[PDB]
Amino acid sequence: KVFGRCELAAAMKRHGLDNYRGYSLGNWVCAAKFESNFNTQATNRNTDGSTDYGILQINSRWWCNDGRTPGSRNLCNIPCSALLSSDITASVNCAKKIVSDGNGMNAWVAWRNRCKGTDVQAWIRGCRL
Ligand SMILES: [Cl-]
């Protein structure tokens, strides 16, 4: 599924991401835009044999198990295939674990480079929430 901006904002708000661990909702919407272009089936392979999965590009070395990544830790305790659903629940629940691990939203490279330091509340402007 490809989400619309406000459609995704509403879904993320229902799942408790607004202000979660100090990160306002616009951070999460901006991260999804630049990580996956709002596509729940986005996948990207890395040089270490890991793959990033889904709307928040969750990595298979640390967080989900895809059965083909050396050194897998599976800290979200979820198959990576569940993160390619059109329903974002599994992705959101794993993202909550990632942001609590320690280093905030710095796990998301596209967030660090393209969202952090900008007015991210613009990403939810005009949405009914
Ligand atoms: Cl899998």
Side-chain angles (χ1 to χ4, degrees):
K1 177 183 176 174
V2 179
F3 276 81
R5 178 179 63 90
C6 290
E7 185 192 11
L8 184 64
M12 287 177 158
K13 186 172 158 62
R14 288 195 291 274
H15 287 273
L17 284 180
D18 190 22
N19 302 131
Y20 187 83
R21 290 296 188 292
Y23 292 96
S24 65
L25 188 62
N27 283 289
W28 300 99
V29 177
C30 186
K33 172 57 182 194
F34 293 129
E35 290 290 343
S36 67
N37 207 18
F38 298 149
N39 189 323
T40 61
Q41 298 188 196
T43 64
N44 174 70
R45 301 181 79 83
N46 298 299
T47 66
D48 68 349
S50 74
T51 301
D52 303 316
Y53 290 92
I55 196 153
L56 285 166
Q57 289 293 278
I58 292 174
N59 184 261
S60 67
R61 187 161 168 185
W62 308 115
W63 306 112
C64 62
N65 180 21
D66 68 3
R68 61 174 47 65
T69 302
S72 174
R73 304 311 189 300
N74 195 15
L75 291 174
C76 287
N77 193 32
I78 194 87
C80 300
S81 75
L83 308 183
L84 299 176
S85 174
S86 291
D87 181 306
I88 65 170
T89 305
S91 287
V92 169
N93 288 339
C94 182
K96 288 179 175 173
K97 295 179 175 77
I98 296 172
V99 292
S100 302
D101 179 59
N103 209 186
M105 289 193 69
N106 288 307
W108 289 281
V109 173
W111 177 87
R112 302 196 304 262
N113 291 331
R114 301 174 74 184
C115 302
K116 183 179 186 294
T118 72
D119 180 9
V120 293
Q121 254 46 256
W123 287 96
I124 62 168
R125 166 203 298 142
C127 304
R128 291 80 180 292
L129 304 174

